[PDB]
mmCIF file of C-alpha atoms and ligand atoms in Angstrom:
data_model
loop_
_atom_site.group_PDB
_atom_site.id
_atom_site.type_symbol
_atom_site.label_atom_id
_atom_site.label_comp_id
_atom_site.label_asym_id
_atom_site.label_seq_id
_atom_site.Cartn_x
_atom_site.Cartn_y
_atom_site.Cartn_z
ATOM 1 C CA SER A 1 -0.312 0.371 -0.195
ATOM 2 C CA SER A 2 3.456 1.825 0.521
ATOM 3 C CA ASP A 3 5.111 3.475 -3.236
ATOM 4 C CA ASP A 4 8.041 3.500 -1.346
ATOM 5 C CA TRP A 5 9.309 7.837 -2.855
ATOM 6 C CA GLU A 6 12.478 7.746 0.038
ATOM 7 C CA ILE A 7 15.292 7.767 -1.609
ATOM 8 C CA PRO A 8 17.296 5.413 0.324
ATOM 9 C CA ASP A 9 20.606 7.740 2.383
ATOM 10 C CA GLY A 10 23.562 7.852 0.886
ATOM 11 C CA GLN A 11 22.946 5.972 -2.797
ATOM 12 C CA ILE A 12 21.887 9.542 -4.761
ATOM 13 C CA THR A 13 25.073 10.882 -7.217
ATOM 14 C CA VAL A 14 24.930 14.505 -8.893
ATOM 15 C CA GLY A 15 27.850 15.348 -11.524
ATOM 16 C CA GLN A 16 27.311 18.393 -14.397
ATOM 17 C CA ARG A 17 25.005 21.087 -13.374
ATOM 18 C CA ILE A 18 22.291 21.841 -15.551
ATOM 19 C CA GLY A 19 20.307 24.824 -14.657
ATOM 20 C CA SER A 20 18.849 26.355 -11.467
ATOM 21 C CA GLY A 21 14.478 25.549 -10.129
ATOM 22 C CA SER A 22 12.401 26.293 -8.050
ATOM 23 C CA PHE A 23 13.790 25.819 -4.571
ATOM 24 C CA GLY A 24 17.771 24.304 -5.471
ATOM 25 C CA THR A 25 20.356 24.083 -8.277
ATOM 26 C CA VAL A 26 19.545 20.825 -10.743
ATOM 27 C CA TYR A 27 22.088 18.328 -11.316
ATOM 28 C CA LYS A 28 22.637 15.182 -14.530
ATOM 29 C CA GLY A 29 22.898 12.355 -11.945
ATOM 30 C CA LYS A 30 22.835 8.859 -10.859
ATOM 31 C CA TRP A 31 20.371 6.720 -9.070
ATOM 32 C CA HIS A 32 20.199 3.214 -10.959
ATOM 33 C CA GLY A 33 21.457 4.880 -13.810
ATOM 34 C CA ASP A 34 21.132 8.362 -15.387
ATOM 35 C CA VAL A 35 19.168 10.237 -14.041
ATOM 36 C CA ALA A 36 17.882 14.127 -13.839
ATOM 37 C CA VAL A 37 18.385 15.449 -9.618
ATOM 38 C CA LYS A 38 16.881 18.442 -8.124
ATOM 39 C CA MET A 39 18.515 19.631 -4.985
ATOM 40 C CA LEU A 40 18.898 22.393 -2.297
ATOM 41 C CA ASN A 41 22.588 22.940 -2.165
ATOM 42 C CA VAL A 42 22.229 24.539 1.502
ATOM 43 C CA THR A 43 22.064 21.315 4.000
ATOM 44 C CA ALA A 44 19.835 23.559 6.842
ATOM 45 C CA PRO A 45 16.349 24.750 4.356
ATOM 46 C CA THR A 46 14.223 27.056 6.284
ATOM 47 C CA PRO A 47 10.983 26.297 7.253
ATOM 48 C CA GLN A 48 9.146 27.842 3.114
ATOM 49 C CA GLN A 49 12.622 26.207 1.226
ATOM 50 C CA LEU A 50 10.889 23.247 2.798
ATOM 51 C CA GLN A 51 7.515 24.004 2.126
ATOM 52 C CA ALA A 52 8.014 24.540 -1.337
ATOM 53 C CA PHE A 53 10.026 21.278 -1.516
ATOM 54 C CA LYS A 54 7.261 19.040 -0.164
ATOM 55 C CA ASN A 55 4.385 20.435 -2.531
ATOM 56 C CA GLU A 56 7.036 19.885 -5.518
ATOM 57 C CA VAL A 57 7.009 15.639 -4.343
ATOM 58 C CA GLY A 58 3.208 15.899 -3.000
ATOM 59 C CA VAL A 59 2.320 17.152 -6.877
ATOM 60 C CA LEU A 60 5.016 15.257 -8.089
ATOM 61 C CA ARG A 61 3.778 11.814 -6.635
ATOM 62 C CA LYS A 62 1.105 11.621 -7.920
ATOM 63 C CA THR A 63 2.039 11.530 -11.700
ATOM 64 C CA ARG A 64 2.241 8.636 -13.784
ATOM 65 C CA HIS A 65 2.071 8.543 -17.244
ATOM 66 C CA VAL A 66 4.419 8.588 -20.709
ATOM 67 C CA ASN A 67 4.483 12.424 -21.973
ATOM 68 C CA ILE A 68 5.002 13.571 -18.172
ATOM 69 C CA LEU A 69 8.708 13.758 -16.300
ATOM 70 C CA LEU A 70 8.514 10.549 -14.657
ATOM 71 C CA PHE A 71 9.338 11.336 -10.690
ATOM 72 C CA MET A 72 11.541 8.351 -9.234
ATOM 73 C CA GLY A 73 11.929 9.680 -5.727
ATOM 74 C CA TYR A 74 12.771 12.001 -2.780
ATOM 75 C CA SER A 75 15.790 12.385 -0.249
ATOM 76 C CA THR A 76 15.741 15.224 2.356
ATOM 77 C CA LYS A 77 19.019 13.939 3.534
ATOM 78 C CA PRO A 78 22.151 15.110 3.452
ATOM 79 C CA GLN A 79 19.823 17.170 1.294
ATOM 80 C CA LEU A 80 16.331 17.562 -0.045
ATOM 81 C CA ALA A 81 16.542 16.559 -3.492
ATOM 82 C CA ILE A 82 13.656 15.238 -6.013
ATOM 83 C CA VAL A 83 14.262 12.695 -8.386
ATOM 84 C CA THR A 84 13.440 11.903 -12.195
ATOM 85 C CA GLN A 85 14.118 9.962 -14.812
ATOM 86 C CA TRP A 86 17.065 11.755 -16.965
ATOM 87 C CA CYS A 87 15.924 12.780 -20.402
ATOM 88 C CA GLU A 88 18.332 12.103 -23.075
ATOM 89 C CA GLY A 89 17.633 14.892 -26.097
ATOM 90 C CA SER A 90 15.802 18.455 -26.380
ATOM 91 C CA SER A 91 13.359 21.223 -25.105
ATOM 92 C CA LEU A 92 10.838 21.652 -27.524
ATOM 93 C CA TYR A 93 11.489 25.376 -27.261
ATOM 94 C CA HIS A 94 15.689 24.587 -27.530
ATOM 95 C CA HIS A 95 14.561 22.807 -31.067
ATOM 96 C CA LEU A 96 12.504 25.335 -32.525
ATOM 97 C CA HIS A 97 14.119 28.486 -31.167
ATOM 98 C CA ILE A 98 17.252 27.677 -30.498
ATOM 99 C CA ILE A 99 18.761 24.958 -32.552
ATOM 100 C CA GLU A 100 16.100 26.121 -35.189
ATOM 101 C CA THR A 101 15.167 22.296 -36.326
ATOM 102 C CA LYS A 102 12.863 21.833 -38.790
ATOM 103 C CA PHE A 103 9.962 18.596 -37.851
ATOM 104 C CA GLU A 104 7.358 17.402 -41.036
ATOM 105 C CA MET A 105 3.534 18.809 -40.471
ATOM 106 C CA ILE A 106 3.286 15.073 -39.000
ATOM 107 C CA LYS A 107 5.659 15.478 -36.530
ATOM 108 C CA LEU A 108 4.507 18.708 -35.092
ATOM 109 C CA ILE A 109 1.314 17.144 -35.011
ATOM 110 C CA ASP A 110 1.591 15.426 -32.969
ATOM 111 C CA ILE A 111 4.050 16.735 -30.701
ATOM 112 C CA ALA A 112 0.637 18.589 -30.338
ATOM 113 C CA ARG A 113 -0.913 15.543 -29.539
ATOM 114 C CA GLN A 114 1.419 14.245 -26.832
ATOM 115 C CA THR A 115 1.787 17.599 -24.620
ATOM 116 C CA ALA A 116 -2.437 17.807 -24.958
ATOM 117 C CA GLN A 117 -2.293 13.943 -23.831
ATOM 118 C CA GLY A 118 0.047 14.648 -20.741
ATOM 119 C CA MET A 119 -2.279 18.308 -20.261
ATOM 120 C CA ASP A 120 -5.634 15.943 -19.879
ATOM 121 C CA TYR A 121 -3.661 13.553 -17.891
ATOM 122 C CA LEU A 122 -2.863 16.406 -15.456
ATOM 123 C CA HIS A 123 -6.006 18.463 -15.480
ATOM 124 C CA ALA A 124 -7.752 14.691 -14.749
ATOM 125 C CA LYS A 125 -5.765 14.830 -11.755
ATOM 126 C CA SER A 126 -6.852 18.597 -11.124
ATOM 127 C CA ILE A 127 -2.989 20.111 -11.613
ATOM 128 C CA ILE A 128 -2.633 23.274 -12.964
ATOM 129 C CA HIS A 129 0.909 23.519 -13.898
ATOM 130 C CA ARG A 130 0.304 27.656 -14.587
ATOM 131 C CA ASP A 131 4.127 27.537 -16.476
ATOM 132 C CA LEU A 132 2.984 25.259 -19.540
ATOM 133 C CA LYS A 133 5.641 27.115 -22.573
ATOM 134 C CA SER A 134 7.675 25.035 -25.105
ATOM 135 C CA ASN A 135 11.120 25.004 -22.666
ATOM 136 C CA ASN A 136 8.824 23.025 -20.173
ATOM 137 C CA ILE A 137 7.847 20.453 -23.816
ATOM 138 C CA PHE A 138 11.164 17.644 -23.682
ATOM 139 C CA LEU A 139 11.671 15.539 -26.807
ATOM 140 C CA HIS A 140 12.943 12.590 -25.199
ATOM 141 C CA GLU A 141 14.827 11.384 -27.282
ATOM 142 C CA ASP A 142 13.378 13.643 -29.794
ATOM 143 C CA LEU A 143 10.034 11.406 -30.189
ATOM 144 C CA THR A 144 8.225 11.190 -26.393
ATOM 145 C CA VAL A 145 7.462 14.695 -24.923
ATOM 146 C CA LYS A 146 7.638 14.829 -21.872
ATOM 147 C CA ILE A 147 5.822 17.885 -19.929
ATOM 148 C CA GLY A 148 7.988 19.138 -16.773
ATOM 149 C CA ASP A 149 8.106 21.862 -14.507
ATOM 150 C CA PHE A 150 11.785 22.624 -15.651
ATOM 151 C CA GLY A 151 13.065 26.165 -14.677
ATOM 152 C CA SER A 152 10.032 36.226 -16.230
ATOM 153 C CA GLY A 153 10.723 34.021 -19.778
ATOM 154 C CA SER A 154 6.719 32.760 -19.410
ATOM 155 C CA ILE A 155 4.743 36.245 -20.609
ATOM 156 C CA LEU A 156 4.333 34.804 -24.071
ATOM 157 C CA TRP A 157 2.443 32.354 -22.683
ATOM 158 C CA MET A 158 0.479 33.884 -20.159
ATOM 159 C CA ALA A 159 -3.495 34.507 -20.339
ATOM 160 C CA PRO A 160 -4.688 38.309 -20.969
ATOM 161 C CA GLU A 161 -6.904 37.367 -17.154
ATOM 162 C CA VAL A 162 -3.142 36.156 -15.746
ATOM 163 C CA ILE A 163 -1.212 38.905 -17.066
ATOM 164 C CA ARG A 164 -4.141 41.623 -15.935
ATOM 165 C CA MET A 165 -3.764 39.374 -11.848
ATOM 166 C CA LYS A 166 -6.408 36.824 -6.762
ATOM 167 C CA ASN A 167 -6.061 33.792 -8.184
ATOM 168 C CA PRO A 168 -6.005 33.451 -12.709
ATOM 169 C CA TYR A 169 -5.156 30.622 -12.615
ATOM 170 C CA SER A 170 -7.500 27.608 -13.986
ATOM 171 C CA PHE A 171 -7.266 24.499 -16.559
ATOM 172 C CA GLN A 172 -7.847 27.461 -19.347
ATOM 173 C CA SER A 173 -5.392 29.562 -18.762
ATOM 174 C CA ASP A 174 -2.976 26.042 -19.514
ATOM 175 C CA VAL A 175 -5.379 25.664 -22.929
ATOM 176 C CA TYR A 176 -4.152 29.248 -23.410
ATOM 177 C CA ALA A 177 -0.370 28.270 -22.523
ATOM 178 C CA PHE A 178 -0.662 25.419 -25.032
ATOM 179 C CA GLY A 179 -2.078 27.557 -27.988
ATOM 180 C CA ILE A 180 0.659 29.488 -27.797
ATOM 181 C CA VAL A 181 2.910 26.428 -28.026
ATOM 182 C CA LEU A 182 0.682 25.294 -31.348
ATOM 183 C CA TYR A 183 1.814 28.989 -32.569
ATOM 184 C CA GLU A 184 5.011 28.334 -31.636
ATOM 185 C CA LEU A 185 5.208 24.512 -33.405
ATOM 186 C CA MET A 186 3.061 26.118 -36.086
ATOM 187 C CA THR A 187 4.688 29.079 -37.431
ATOM 188 C CA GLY A 188 8.415 27.736 -35.610
ATOM 189 C CA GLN A 189 8.247 31.228 -33.877
ATOM 190 C CA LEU A 190 8.110 32.745 -30.808
ATOM 191 C CA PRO A 191 4.896 35.209 -30.823
ATOM 192 C CA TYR A 192 4.892 38.803 -31.047
ATOM 193 C CA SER A 193 8.274 38.848 -33.229
ATOM 194 C CA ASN A 194 8.046 42.523 -34.101
ATOM 195 C CA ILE A 195 7.547 43.601 -30.497
ATOM 196 C CA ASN A 196 11.053 44.886 -29.171
ATOM 197 C CA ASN A 197 9.284 46.034 -25.829
ATOM 198 C CA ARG A 198 8.221 43.392 -22.760
ATOM 199 C CA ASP A 199 6.178 46.222 -21.025
ATOM 200 C CA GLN A 200 4.134 47.255 -23.770
ATOM 201 C CA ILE A 201 3.223 42.688 -24.322
ATOM 202 C CA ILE A 202 2.636 42.511 -21.379
ATOM 203 C CA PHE A 203 0.102 45.713 -21.122
ATOM 204 C CA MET A 204 -1.427 45.039 -24.419
ATOM 205 C CA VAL A 205 -2.092 41.159 -24.406
ATOM 206 C CA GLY A 206 -3.703 42.275 -20.206
ATOM 207 C CA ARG A 207 -6.373 44.504 -22.568
ATOM 208 C CA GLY A 208 -6.956 41.872 -25.281
ATOM 209 C CA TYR A 209 -5.731 45.107 -27.706
ATOM 210 C CA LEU A 210 -3.211 42.585 -29.089
ATOM 211 C CA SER A 211 -2.773 38.522 -29.668
ATOM 212 C CA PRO A 212 -1.055 36.215 -31.881
ATOM 213 C CA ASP A 213 -0.737 36.899 -35.466
ATOM 214 C CA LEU A 214 -2.397 33.816 -36.852
ATOM 215 C CA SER A 215 -1.386 34.788 -40.575
ATOM 216 C CA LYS A 216 1.669 33.383 -39.571
ATOM 217 C CA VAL A 217 0.783 29.444 -39.807
ATOM 218 C CA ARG A 218 2.869 27.147 -42.087
ATOM 219 C CA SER A 219 0.904 26.737 -45.165
ATOM 220 C CA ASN A 220 0.256 23.161 -44.892
ATOM 221 C CA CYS A 221 -0.629 23.943 -41.248
ATOM 222 C CA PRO A 222 -4.737 22.069 -41.782
ATOM 223 C CA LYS A 223 -7.095 24.684 -41.362
ATOM 224 C CA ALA A 224 -8.781 22.240 -38.195
ATOM 225 C CA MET A 225 -5.884 22.906 -36.585
ATOM 226 C CA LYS A 226 -5.608 26.661 -36.857
ATOM 227 C CA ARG A 227 -9.625 26.786 -35.621
ATOM 228 C CA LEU A 228 -8.341 24.868 -32.420
ATOM 229 C CA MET A 229 -5.141 27.133 -32.459
ATOM 230 C CA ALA A 230 -8.022 29.932 -32.030
ATOM 231 C CA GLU A 231 -9.675 28.380 -29.588
ATOM 232 C CA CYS A 232 -7.223 27.310 -27.037
ATOM 233 C CA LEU A 233 -6.118 31.661 -27.773
ATOM 234 C CA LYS A 234 -9.405 33.219 -27.141
ATOM 235 C CA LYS A 235 -9.400 36.407 -25.109
ATOM 236 C CA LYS A 236 -11.606 35.715 -23.029
ATOM 237 C CA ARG A 237 -11.111 31.999 -20.187
ATOM 238 C CA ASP A 238 -14.849 30.968 -20.474
ATOM 239 C CA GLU A 239 -14.705 30.306 -24.222
ATOM 240 C CA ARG A 240 -11.662 28.265 -23.956
ATOM 241 C CA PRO A 241 -12.156 24.512 -24.566
ATOM 242 C CA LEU A 242 -10.462 21.595 -21.967
ATOM 243 C CA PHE A 243 -8.320 19.647 -23.329
ATOM 244 C CA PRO A 244 -10.465 16.060 -23.634
ATOM 245 C CA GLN A 245 -12.005 18.396 -26.359
ATOM 246 C CA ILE A 246 -9.169 19.303 -27.342
ATOM 247 C CA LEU A 247 -7.457 16.178 -27.532
ATOM 248 C CA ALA A 248 -10.492 14.985 -29.819
ATOM 249 C CA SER A 249 -9.719 17.668 -32.424
ATOM 250 C CA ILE A 250 -5.905 17.272 -32.421
ATOM 251 C CA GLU A 251 -6.546 13.331 -32.804
ATOM 252 C CA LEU A 252 -9.271 13.733 -35.273
ATOM 253 C CA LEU A 253 -6.766 16.151 -37.855
ATOM 254 C CA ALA A 254 -3.768 13.727 -37.838
ATOM 255 C CA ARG A 255 -6.613 11.066 -38.915
ATOM 256 C CA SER A 256 -7.244 13.452 -41.794
ATOM 257 C CA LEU A 257 -3.849 14.148 -43.474
HETATM 258 C C1 LIG B 301 15.306 17.119 -11.303
HETATM 259 C C2 LIG B 301 13.816 17.292 -11.449
HETATM 260 C C3 LIG B 301 13.189 17.185 -9.727
HETATM 261 C C4 LIG B 301 11.199 18.169 -9.851
HETATM 262 C C5 LIG B 301 11.054 18.934 -11.022
HETATM 263 N N1 LIG B 301 9.660 19.066 -11.022
HETATM 264 C C6 LIG B 301 9.244 19.464 -12.282
HETATM 265 O O1 LIG B 301 9.679 19.015 -13.500
HETATM 266 C C7 LIG B 301 7.402 19.975 -12.150
HETATM 267 C C8 LIG B 301 7.445 20.142 -11.047
HETATM 268 C C9 LIG B 301 5.999 21.182 -10.561
HETATM 269 C C10 LIG B 301 4.592 20.597 -10.899
HETATM 270 C C11 LIG B 301 5.351 19.611 -12.117
HETATM 271 C C12 LIG B 301 3.919 18.641 -13.496
HETATM 272 F F1 LIG B 301 4.186 19.267 -14.768
HETATM 273 F F2 LIG B 301 3.758 17.970 -13.331
HETATM 274 F F3 LIG B 301 2.695 19.325 -13.232
HETATM 275 C C13 LIG B 301 7.145 19.246 -12.615
HETATM 276 C C14 LIG B 301 11.904 18.910 -12.456
HETATM 277 C C15 LIG B 301 12.984 18.876 -12.616
HETATM 278 C C16 LIG B 301 14.280 18.651 -13.635
HETATM 279 C C17 LIG B 301 14.539 17.675 -14.778
HETATM 280 C C18 LIG B 301 15.016 17.928 -16.116
HETATM 281 C C19 LIG B 301 15.325 18.835 -16.207
HETATM 282 C C20 LIG B 301 15.232 19.406 -15.481
HETATM 283 C C21 LIG B 301 14.072 19.742 -14.002
HETATM 284 N N2 LIG B 301 15.635 21.038 -15.652
HETATM 285 C C22 LIG B 301 16.605 20.835 -17.231
HETATM 286 O O2 LIG B 301 17.664 21.598 -17.581
HETATM 287 N N3 LIG B 301 15.929 19.652 -17.289
HETATM 288 C C23 LIG B 301 16.936 18.641 -18.569
#
C-alpha cells in the first residue's frame, strides 16, 4: 500500500550542474542509472524552502504517464532532493528557437497531440501546470513528449487574465499557454517578434489589444489546427475548450492528413 518514494540515504550522486529549478540546482546524476536531480544547495532548509519541496513532491508523486516527466523519488538527507528520469534530447523551445530543427507537419501535430495528452492527464488529477511553454516540453529521444516544470521568460504564454492579476490560474489559463505552444509549432516562431518592448506586450495582451498573428502559420498547417489554435487563444477564459475536447480535435485532424 506504500509507494516507497523516499530514496534510501547515501545513494544519490550528482555530476554536471545543468541548471536552476524552483528551490535549488538541477544536476545530471546517478541513482539506478542516469537521473536528473533537483537539489537544495544548503543542508539546513528554511521552513519556506522545505514547504516548497513538500508541495513539489506532493504534485509529482501523483503522476504516472508517458507524457509527464517521470518522478522517481525524493531524499531529505543530507539535502532536499527530487529525482526524476534523465531525458536525452532537447526541449521543444531549444529545437524551435535555438537550433531551429525543421520538423515535418505529421511530427509537429504529434508533438501537439502528446502535449495535450499529458495536459489532459494533469488536469484530470486537478494539477494546473501554471507555466506551460515550449521550454517545459521535452522531446525525449526527440520522439516522446515529457511535460515537466524545468525552470520572467513566460509572458508570451500568459493568458490575458493571468497578465492582468487573486488567483487567475485555471485549466483555461493552461489551455491558453497550450494555444501559444500550438502557435510556436505551426509558425516556428515566438509570438510578437516585431515588438521589442516587454512592458507593451504585457499591457496590450492584458487589455486584449494584442493577440498572436495566426496568418503566420505554415502553408501545410491544416485548417482545423488553425481553428483549434484560435479557440485555445480566446481572450475570455470561459470561451476556451478543455483538454478532452482539444485532444479529440488533434486526434481527428491527425487522421485526416
Ligand atoms: C530533477 C527535477 C525535479 C523536479 C522537477 N519538477 C517538475 O518537472 C515539476 C514540478 C511541479 C509540477 C510539475 C508538473 F509538470 F507535473 F506539473 C513538474 C523537475 C526536474 C528536472 C528534470 C530535468 C531537467 C530539469 C529539471 N531542468 C533541466 O534543464 N532538465 C533537463
